[PDB]
């Protein structure tokens, strides 16, 4: 059986997406998650919703307890984790409102714990950071819904809370980055360490500055949130009808063998 | 009315620049500024001088309390902030002794608080980090003084205290950086958050290593400090004769709307 | 006279390399070193061995006390420091098992103290981070041993503990990096500040991901550790037969004049 964890990003964390919801505040060895876990279902698939910045959206990217969030979802029994995230576009073809099913990341964060093994020692591989099988279903589903969707993309995650300078924005383009946010790393890294199939639904809200402002971002998100909701509602039932016995087995093995015992 | 805050950099923090000076030690919600504020005037313009590294120059780049410094200047009523900074040149055309009126930056710092909102949440735009109107006057004034001056430039700020390796120096050139220091970020970022018109007078002291040493840097600064002093003395009266009612209004608005309320 | 400090890296820290060994636990102003110092000799040359991750290899890259390690070696009287380090290859010509006598580095670490002067202020030059005379002997010796050895290379040091993403791996190649590890910085930086001749024997264990895993790395290291051991055993006697009176004098001077007194 599968259980989908869902981490709602800025303006993309509507709990109405789940039926038969039940709130559940939890705790973890790394502190409390951003907010209470929302247990519920999409069709016959068990899901767990968690607002990344809190239902009040008061926690800044740098202060989000990524460790607690991923740990909590794992503890609740989540096999997969699909998240949503607002980001800026670094490519002309990626227009505001467009969905990007990212497949790579470039870390630009500086003050963020990125491992559960803060002391054995865990050196987890990051070649393919996002669950390919889940990304495949998201892409096919976006297509069935007729949505503008990019099948891949490299997300550069900055520390924030400030936005990038134009020089940084142009620089990131030369490094091969396609979109930019403040939350993909270390969320994706910790999910890998937990042996969880992780995928991200990035929602381009602007062209960064290669013009970007809070109001601009919140505005585009409001106008496009429905897309991410529809994609999740349609995608998830499809995951609950596929076999992941082997896929999850490989993630479990990679995570375990990446730990150096004393 | 306007009040110019002046942050003196290494070997470019001579308080003799101001007339009718009065020392004033202050405190802020983020601790004490690098040193006492020096209230005074340049012609009929009120100014506030603050030595970035302390009149004894004992505070290292990484330990400077940028938050307190900017907060203190803002509290004292500063509308503008013009600073001086020693830097290394990453371009052949930028010769030691040359002044560079920087217009962009690339962050390479890692352990520095960059916001006043360390917890609402402030996501301040950084497209145009330096006050264009002030930069314009600095450039025209350098021209009137017959000084070698570059009208723009991208400053990469490293964490320090160590200088860059040759591989990093060459790498920064490929990212589009023109000069390099250890203090522009987050000073410029926090000034933007405070709604202050910020501009920087960068003084190239060497060609970094693409050879750079403390003695080399201090030597070139000693020989060229007079330029920055003359530029400030001549520029400031010009700012006190221009209208900024609208310019300051836009900075105030951008700062305010960049705060996410709980 | 000379005394060679040896910092053993992952799977390259065998104490059997020294004769007439004597364990010696020490303390420093920055805490205790990774493990006890192992005093001994290679022929008639006094050496001091120190396992970077501890004889139990339980300390992760980010948590290694580089300050204490370098301080301890300096206090014991070490004039030179030759280390070994497992790394990933970012160049086709650098094959797993190959030795790389690195000559440059690119810092990608974020949470690491990099100076002994955490408060005067020390701004130490990093143009030529590795001792050229020692690198020369290592290269000639590898040649005499008939080993595959690269005479130079740029090491990019990531924070870890996670490995790089493919996007980061490709990005590092464009920045000019040749190999990648998690320990060169700040070990090399602090050694320079201490006025110590520092050189590194990098052992390529894989092609990173431009596939890399703990087991892959440990496997290649086990199969190739003998090379680093032979190189050290053969190189060190050669250093004890050369003159360094002037070489060490210049390092001492550069370190001293890089300190800003209050
Ligand atoms: C409330 S706007 C800031 C938030 O939106 C995301 N965002 C949107 C556009 C954008 C950009 N151009 N650069 C960085 N983060 C961005 C970030 O992950 C952060 O949590
Ligand atoms: C006392 S020399 C170090 C100081 O001078 C500035 N500086 C000068 C040259 C230079 C360089 N090549 N790289 C980095 N900082 C530099 C830095 O901002 C630091 O506060
Ligand atoms: C036990 S594997 C991790 C350790 O081996 C080194 N290593 C080996 C290959 C490699 C890579 N591709 N990227 C980063 N570090 C690496 C690092 O310095 C770390 O201490």
Query: What radius of gyration, in Å, describes the C-alpha atoms of chain B?
Result: 17
B13, B103, B208, B215: the catalytic one is B208
Is residue A129 within 8 Å of residue A188, measured between CB atoms? yes
* Spatial separation of the C-alpha atoms in residues A159 and A173, rounded to whole Å: 17
Give the residue among B99, B109, B73 at the shortest CA–CA distance from B191: B73
| Residue C215 sits at the chain A interface (C-beta within 8 Å) | yes
Which residues have C-beta within 8 Å of that of residue C248, sequence separation ≥ 6?
C79, C195, C197
Element (H, E) at C158: strand C154-158
Q: Which ligand is nearest to the CA of B63?
A: 2
- B118 in active site: no
* Spatial separation of the C-alpha atoms in residues C202 and C97, rounded to whole Å: 10
* Spatial separation of the C-alpha atoms in residues C213 and C235, rounded to whole Å: 31
For residue B162, which residues of chain C lie inside 8 Å, CB to CB?
A: 114-115, 122-124, 126, 189, 192-193
Give me the phi and psi of C149, to 5 degrees please: -145, 135
Give burial (CB, 10 Å; 0-12/13-18/19+) of B136: middle
What's the maximum distance between 2 C-alpha atoms anywhere in chain C?
52
Across the interface, whether the CB atoms of A211 and B106 are under 8 A apart is answered no
Rounded to the nearest whole angstrom, what is the distance from the C-alpha of residue A183 to the centroid of ligand 1?
8
Give the residue among A182, A221, A178, A183 at the shortest CA–CA distance from A203: A221
Which residues have C-beta within 8 Å of that of residue C253, sequence separation ≥ 6?
none
Is residue B189 within 8 Å of residue A162, measured between CB atoms? yes
* Spatial separation of the C-alpha atoms in residues A99 and A143, rounded to whole Å: 11
Q: Is B38 in the pocket of ligand 2 (CB under 6 A)?
A: no
Count the neighbouring beta carbons within 10 Å of the beta carbon of residue A164: 26
Between the alpha carbon of residue A254 and those of residues A259, B116, C214, C215, the distances in Å are: 9, 41, 10, 10
Across the interface, whether the CB atoms of A257 and C167 are under 8 A apart is answered no
Between the alpha carbon of residue C226 and those of residues A46, A88, C142, C222, the distances in Å are: 54, 50, 12, 8
CA-A184 nearest atom, ligand 1: 18
Q: Which long-range contacts (CB under 8 A, 24 or more apart) does A13-20 make?
A: A13/A49, A13/A51, A13/A52, A13/A53, A13/A55, A13/A57, A13/A84, A14/A225, A14/A229, A15/A40, A15/A49, A15/A51, A15/A55, A17/A42, A17/A49, A17/A229, A17/A232, A17/A233, A18/A42, A18/A47, A18/A49
Find out whether A206 is annotated in a ligand binding site: yes
Give the residue among B247, B171, B153 at the shortest CA–CA distance from B209: B171
Element (H, E) at C260: strand C259-260
Is residue A251 within 8 Å of residue A74, measured between CB atoms? no
Q: Which residue of B has its CA nearest to A175?
A: B175
Q: Is B212 in the pocket of ligand 2 (CB under 6 A)?
A: yes
Q: Is B13 in the pocket of ligand 2 (CB under 6 A)?
A: no
What DSSP assignment string belongs to A59-85? --GGG--HHHHHHHHHHTT-SEEEEEE
Query: Which residues' Cβ are closer than 6 Å to ligand 1?
Result: A 10, 61, 85-88, 158, 163, 180-183, 205-206, 208, 212, 214, 217; B 123
Give the residue among B108, B123, B109, B33 at the shortest CA–CA distance from B78: B33
End-to-end CA distance of chain A: 34
* Spatial separation of the C-alpha atoms in residues A231 and C126, rounded to whole Å: 51
Q: Is B66 in the pocket of ligand 2 (CB under 6 A)?
A: no
Give burial (CB, 10 Å; 0-12/13-18/19+) of A133: middle
For residue B176, which residues of chain A lie inside 8 Å, CB to CB?
A: 167, 170-171
Cα A86 from chain centre: 10
Q: Which residue of B has its CA nearest to C115?
A: B161
Q: What CATH number corresponds to the domain at position B249?
A: 3.40.50.1580
Give me the residue label for tokens 């992760």. Answer: C60
B35, B103, B107, B206: the catalytic one is B206
Q: Which two tokens stand for residue A169?
A: 């924005």
Count the neighbouring beta carbons within 10 Å of the beta carbon of residue A18: 23
Q: Which residues constitute the domain of residue A57?
A: 1-262
Element (H, E) at C80: strand C80-89
Is residue C114 within 8 Å of residue C124, measured between CB atoms? no
Technique used: X-ray
Q: Which two tokens stand for residue B190?
A: 């926090």
Mutation target for B interface from A111, A161, A166, A181: give the one with most B CBs within 10 A: A161
Q: Which ligand is nearest to the CA of A157?
A: 1
* Spatial separation of the C-alpha atoms in residues B45 and B175, rounded to whole Å: 39
| Residue B171 sits at the chain C interface (C-beta within 8 Å) | yes
* Spatial separation of the C-alpha atoms in residues A66 and A32, rounded to whole Å: 10
Which residues have C-beta within 8 Å of that of residue A41, sequence separation ≥ 6?
A18, A19, A20, A47
Query: What radius of gyration, in Å, describes the C-alpha atoms of chain C?
Result: 17
| Residue B189 sits at the chain A interface (C-beta within 8 Å) | yes
| Residue B127 sits at the chain C interface (C-beta within 8 Å) | no
Which residues have C-beta within 8 Å of that of residue C118, sequence separation ≥ 6?
none
Mutation target for B interface from A167, A214, A216: give the one with most B CBs within 10 A: A167
Is residue A97 within 8 Å of residue A157, measured between CB atoms? no
The minimum CA-CA distance between A261 and chain C, rounded to whole Å, is 7
Is residue C99 within 8 Å of residue C202, measured between CB atoms? yes
Q: Which of residues 67-126 of C touch B (CB under 8 A)?
A: 104-107, 109-111, 114-115, 117, 119-126
Instruction: List strand residue ranges (DSSP E) for chain B, in order.
Output: 3-8, 19-24, 37-42, 45-51, 80-89, 99-100, 104-108, 121-122, 149-150, 154-158, 179-181, 197-206, 259-260
Rounded to the nearest whole angstrom, what is the distance from the C-alpha of residue B161 to the centroid of ligand 2?
9
Query: What radius of gyration, in Å, describes the C-alpha atoms of chain A?
Result: 17
Across the interface, whether the CB atoms of C160 and A123 are under 8 A apart is answered yes
| Residue C209 sits at the chain A interface (C-beta within 8 Å) | yes
Number of folded domains that form chain B: 1
Element (H, E) at C81: strand C80-89
| Residue A28 sits at the chain C interface (C-beta within 8 Å) | no
Cα B238 from chain centre: 19
Resolution (angstroms) equals 2.1
What DSSP assignment string belongs to B100-128? E---EEEEE--S----S----EE---BSS
Between the alpha carbon of residue B14 and those of residues A83, B81, C35, the distances in Å are: 54, 16, 49
Give the residue among C219, C184, C248, C241 at the shortest CA–CA distance from C11: C219
Is residue C23 within 8 Å of residue C40, measured between CB atoms? no
Give me the residue from A59, A163, A170 closest to B123, CB to CB: A163
Give me the residue from B110, B159, B163 closest to C125, CB to CB: B163
Q: Which two tokens stand for residue C91?
A: 């160049």
Give me the residue from A56, A63, A165 closest to B104, CB to CB: A165
What's the maximum distance between 2 C-alpha atoms anywhere in chain A?
52
Rounded to the nearest whole angstrom, what is the distance from the C-alpha of residue A204 to the centroid of ligand 1?
9
Helix (H, G, I), strand (E, B) or coil at B84: strand
End-to-end CA distance of chain C: 34
The two beta strands, C149-150 and C99-100, are parallel
Rounded to the nearest whole angstrom, what is the distance from the C-alpha of residue A52 to the centroid of ligand 1?
13
For residue C51, which residues of chain A lie inside 8 Å, CB to CB?
A: none
Which residues have C-beta within 8 Å of that of residue B103, sequence separation ≥ 6?
B128, B129, B130, B132, B135, B152, B153, B154
Region for A96 from its dihedrals, namely left if φ exceeds 0, alpha if ψ lies in -120 to 50, beta otherwise: beta
* Spatial separation of the C-alpha atoms in residues B69 and B28, rounded to whole Å: 9
Give the residue among A85, A60, A88, A83 at the shortest CA–CA distance from A180: A88
Count the neighbouring beta carbons within 10 Å of the beta carbon of residue B178: 26
Burial of C190-210, coded b for 16+ CB within 10 Å and e otherwise, reads bbbbbbbbbbbbbbbbbbbbb
For residue A259, which residues of chain C lie inside 8 Å, CB to CB?
A: 214
DSSP state of A243: -
* Spatial separation of the C-alpha atoms in residues B27 and B5, rounded to whole Å: 16
Count the neighbouring beta carbons within 10 Å of the beta carbon of residue B41: 17
Find out whether A205 is annotated in a ligand binding site: no
- A208 in active site: yes
Which residues have C-beta within 8 Å of that of residue A243, sequence separation ≥ 6?
none
* Spatial separation of the C-alpha atoms in residues B86 and B40, rounded to whole Å: 24
Instruction: List strand residue ranges (DSSP E) for chain A, in order.
Output: 3-8, 19-24, 37-42, 45-51, 80-89, 99-100, 104-108, 121-122, 149-150, 154-158, 179-181, 197-206, 259-260
Which residues have C-beta within 8 Å of that of residue B199, sequence separation ≥ 6?
B80, B81, B82, B83, B101, B130, B131, B134, B135, B138
| Residue A176 sits at the chain C interface (C-beta within 8 Å) | yes
Cα A33 from chain centre: 15
Give the residue among A212, A217, A208 at the shortest CA–CA distance from A169: A208
Region for B115 from its dihedrals, namely left if φ exceeds 0, alpha if ψ lies in -120 to 50, beta otherwise: beta
* Spatial separation of the C-alpha atoms in residues B62 and B52, rounded to whole Å: 12
| Residue A176 sits at the chain B interface (C-beta within 8 Å) | no
Q: Tell how many helices (H) and how many strands (E) occur in chain C.
A: 6, 13
Q: Which long-range contacts (CB under 8 A, 24 or more apart) does C61-64 make?
A: C61/C159, C61/C160, C61/C161, C61/C182, C61/C183, C62/C109, C62/C111, C62/C112, C62/C159, C62/C160, C62/C161, C62/C182, C63/A119, C64/C34, C64/C183
End-to-end CA distance of chain B: 34
Across the interface, whether the CB atoms of B60 and C119 are under 8 A apart is answered yes
* Spatial separation of the C-alpha atoms in residues C115 and C186, rounded to whole Å: 8
Neighbours of chain C (3+ CB pairs under 8 A): A, B
Cα B138 from chain centre: 13
Q: Which ligand is nearest to the CA of B203?
A: 2
Give the residue among A23, A53, A65, A82 at the shortest CA–CA distance from A234: A82
* Spatial separation of the C-alpha atoms in residues C237 and C42, rounded to whole Å: 7
The minimum CA-CA distance between A208 and chain B, rounded to whole Å, is 9
Is residue A149 within 8 Å of residue A139, measured between CB atoms? yes
Count of A-B CB contacts under 8 Å: 86
Q: Which ligand is nearest to the CA of B157?
A: 2
């Amino acid at each position: 059986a599968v259980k989908i964890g869902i981490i709602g990003g800025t303006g993309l964390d509507d709990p109405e997406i789940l039926e038969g919801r039940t709130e559940k505040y939890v705790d973890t060895p790394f502190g409390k998650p951003s907010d209470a876990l929302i247990l519920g279902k999409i069709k016959n698939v068990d899901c767990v919703l968690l607002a990344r910045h809190g239902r009040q959206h008061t926690i800044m990217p740098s202060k989000v307890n990524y460790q607690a969030n991923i740990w909590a979802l794992k503890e609740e029994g989540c096999t997969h984790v699909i998240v949503t995230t607002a980001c800026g576009s670094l490519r002309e073809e990626i227009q505001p409102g467009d969905i990007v099913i990212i497949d790579q990341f470039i870390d630009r964060t500086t003050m963020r714990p990125q491992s559960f093994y803060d002391g054995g020692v865990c050196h987890i591989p990051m070649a393919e950071p996002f669950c390919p099988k889940t990304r495949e279903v998201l892409i096919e589903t976006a297509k069935k819904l007729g949505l503008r969707c990019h099948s891949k993309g490299t997300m550069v995650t900055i520390e924030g809370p400030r936005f990038s300078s134009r020089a940084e924005s142009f620089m990131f383009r030369t490094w091969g980055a396609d979109v930019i946010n403040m939350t993909t790393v270390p969320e994706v890294v910790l999910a890998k360490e937990a042996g969880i199939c992780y995928a991200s639904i990035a929602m381009a809200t602007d062209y960064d500055c290669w013009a970007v402002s809070v109001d601009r971002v919140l505005k585009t998100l409001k106008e496009n949130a429905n897309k991410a909701k529809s994609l999740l509602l349609t995608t998830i039932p499809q995951i609950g009808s596929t076999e992941w016995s082997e896929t999850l087995h490989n993630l479990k093995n990679m995570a375990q063998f990446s730990v150096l015992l004393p």
